[PDB]
Enzyme design. Structure first.
Site, PDB file in Angstrom:
ATOM      1  N   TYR A  49       0.855  -1.190   0.000  1.00 29.51           N
ATOM      2  CA  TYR A  49       0.000   0.000   0.000  1.00 29.51           C
ATOM      3  C   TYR A  49       0.873   1.214   0.000  1.00 29.51           C
ATOM      4  O   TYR A  49       1.789   1.357   0.805  1.00 29.51           O
ATOM      5  CB  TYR A  49      -0.882   0.043   1.239  1.00 29.51           C
ATOM      6  CG  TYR A  49      -1.739   1.241   1.523  1.00 29.51           C
ATOM      7  CD1 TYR A  49      -2.557   1.825   0.543  1.00 29.51           C
ATOM      8  CD2 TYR A  49      -1.725   1.773   2.778  1.00 29.51           C
ATOM      9  CE1 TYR A  49      -3.363   2.919   0.813  1.00 29.51           C
ATOM     10  CE2 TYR A  49      -2.557   2.867   3.093  1.00 29.51           C
ATOM     11  CZ  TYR A  49      -3.371   3.410   2.119  1.00 29.51           C
ATOM     12  OH  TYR A  49      -4.197   4.453   2.443  1.00 29.51           O
ATOM     13  N   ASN A  51       0.161   5.606  -0.197  1.00 26.48           N
ATOM     14  CA  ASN A  51      -0.247   6.970  -0.541  1.00 26.48           C
ATOM     15  C   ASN A  51       0.960   7.648  -1.085  1.00 26.48           C
ATOM     16  O   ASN A  51       1.954   7.780  -0.380  1.00 26.48           O
ATOM     17  CB  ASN A  51      -0.789   7.710   0.679  1.00 26.48           C
ATOM     18  CG  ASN A  51      -2.091   7.164   1.126  1.00 26.48           C
ATOM     19  OD1 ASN A  51      -3.051   7.145   0.338  1.00 26.48           O
ATOM     20  ND2 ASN A  51      -2.128   6.658   2.374  1.00 26.48           N
ATOM     21  N   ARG A  95     -11.628   9.178  -8.087  1.00 27.25           N
ATOM     22  CA  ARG A  95     -12.644   9.312  -7.020  1.00 27.25           C
ATOM     23  C   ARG A  95     -12.381  10.521  -6.160  1.00 27.25           C
ATOM     24  O   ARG A  95     -11.336  11.185  -6.310  1.00 27.25           O
ATOM     25  CB  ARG A  95     -12.622   8.019  -6.167  1.00 27.25           C
ATOM     26  CG  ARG A  95     -11.448   7.843  -5.267  1.00 27.25           C
ATOM     27  CD  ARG A  95     -11.533   6.434  -4.597  1.00 27.25           C
ATOM     28  NE  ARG A  95     -10.725   6.384  -3.423  1.00 27.25           N
ATOM     29  CZ  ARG A  95      -9.459   5.935  -3.325  1.00 27.25           C
ATOM     30  NH1 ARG A  95      -8.861   5.369  -4.354  1.00 27.25           N
ATOM     31  NH2 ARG A  95      -8.819   6.097  -2.211  1.00 27.25           N
ATOM     32  N   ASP A  97     -12.450  11.173  -1.969  1.00 24.76           N
ATOM     33  CA  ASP A  97     -12.654  10.747  -0.598  1.00 24.76           C
ATOM     34  C   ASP A  97     -12.795  11.998   0.243  1.00 24.76           C
ATOM     35  O   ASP A  97     -11.967  12.895   0.177  1.00 24.76           O
ATOM     36  CB  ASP A  97     -11.491   9.895  -0.031  1.00 24.76           C
ATOM     37  CG  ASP A  97     -11.314   8.537  -0.686  1.00 24.76           C
ATOM     38  OD1 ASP A  97     -12.042   8.222  -1.608  1.00 24.76           O
ATOM     39  OD2 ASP A  97     -10.361   7.830  -0.193  1.00 24.76           O
ATOM     40  N   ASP A 128      -2.449   5.178  -4.153  1.00 23.89           N
ATOM     41  CA  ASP A 128      -3.328   6.365  -4.325  1.00 23.89           C
ATOM     42  C   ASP A 128      -2.456   7.560  -4.591  1.00 23.89           C
ATOM     43  O   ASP A 128      -1.532   7.845  -3.859  1.00 23.89           O
ATOM     44  CB  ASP A 128      -4.224   6.569  -3.110  1.00 23.89           C
ATOM     45  CG  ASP A 128      -5.502   5.718  -3.140  1.00 23.89           C
ATOM     46  OD1 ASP A 128      -5.940   5.244  -4.192  1.00 23.89           O
ATOM     47  OD2 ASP A 128      -6.108   5.648  -1.991  1.00 23.89           O
TER      48      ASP A 128
HETATM   49  C1  LIG Z   1      -2.883  11.225   3.655  1.00 22.01           C
HETATM   50  C2  LIG Z   1      -4.253  11.007   2.973  1.00 22.01           C
HETATM   51  C3  LIG Z   1      -4.560   9.547   3.058  1.00 22.01           C
HETATM   52  C4  LIG Z   1      -5.972   9.229   2.503  1.00 22.01           C
HETATM   53  C5  LIG Z   1      -6.509   7.785   2.614  1.00 22.01           C
HETATM   54  O1  LIG Z   1      -6.882   7.147   3.927  1.00 22.01           O
HETATM   55  C6  LIG Z   1      -7.636   7.800   1.549  1.00 22.01           C
HETATM   56  N1  LIG Z   1      -8.694   8.611   1.579  1.00 22.01           N
HETATM   57  O2  LIG Z   1      -7.586   7.031   0.614  1.00 22.01           O
END
Ligand SMILES: CCCC[C@@H](O)C(N)=O
Ligand SMILES: CCCC[C@@H](O)C(N)=O
EC number: 3.3.2.8
Lengths: 144, 155
Positions: A49, A51, A95, A97, A128
């Protein structure tokens, strides 16, 4: 979450058309659990994973810990997938979030493009991509 | 450009398998031209471009202006697509672009996930997602402070 101006108009653009796309949308639905133990069930052993503005995590325990850590400081209040597509072992989601920073109570609609690698329906990778600075500035919290 | 540790091993993962995927990989090859006028030929009339940390551009003249402005201060020296996939009217690329900042001569391997919207093989939208601050720090330039106000003029 309102549809960005640039979202593809066909309703099919955000819907799954394959078994792997469907799994990834189920996982997207699961995110608002904010529950690392629930989410880790979707992952293969040989997984990662990231970010992308922050360091990667390799293996399930690290992925679960990283998620658990994130959920201590922020909540996913809502997810909307505008666009989904795929290839063998790959699914992509554009997307938003909606993320709330628990120390400040402030929220931000985070624009995210994500990629998922799969084997036999299980996640072997999740990355992501987004701009971290914009998020920090919106919720008044340095995260890096 | 070396392949990240996490790249899919199958050789086909970064190869096109549809006509739209093929056109997008042609477009990626074209980027190293650094030539906005060449690139704009791939775009529909009803189009947009956005590097997601900066404001969007709508319509071909704005898209062309935005690319031209970028190419006045940075060079795309190389592009590698690791992963490509699609749906109707949609193509996605996980890639690295090697960006060289002309003012400082410094280069950065910028990790990008991009989406392209298409209609009859023409680009109706292109959005690239990445972290701007990491790039600014690597090439020692306050990019947002320069390109954000320029992008606001374009609009
Ligand atoms: C530092 C932003 C991390 C975001 C993550 O938990 C998500 N919304 O995918
Ligand atoms: C602000 C960075 C933009 C980079 C862009 O020209 C690219 N390589 O896609």
């Amino acid at each position: 979450i309102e549809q960005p101006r640039w979202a593809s108009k066909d309703p099919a653009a955000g819907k799954a058309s394959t078994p792997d796309e469907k799994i990834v949308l189920e996982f997207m639905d699961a995110l608002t659990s904010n529950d690392a133990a629930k989410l880790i069930k979707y992952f293969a052993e040989d997984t990662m994973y990231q970010n992308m503005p922050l360091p990667p995590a390799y293996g399930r325990d690290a992925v679960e810990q990283t998620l658990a850590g994130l959920f201590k400081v922020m909540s996913i209040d809502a997810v909307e997938v505008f666009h989904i597509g795929s290839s063998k072992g790959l699914v992509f989601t554009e997307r938003v979030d909606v993320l709330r920073a628990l120390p400040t109570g402030k929220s931000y609609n985070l624009s995210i493009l994500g990629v998922f690698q799969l084997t036999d329906g299980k996640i072997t990778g999740w990355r992501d991509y987004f701009d971290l600075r914009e998020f920090e500035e919106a919720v008044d919290l340095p995260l890096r």
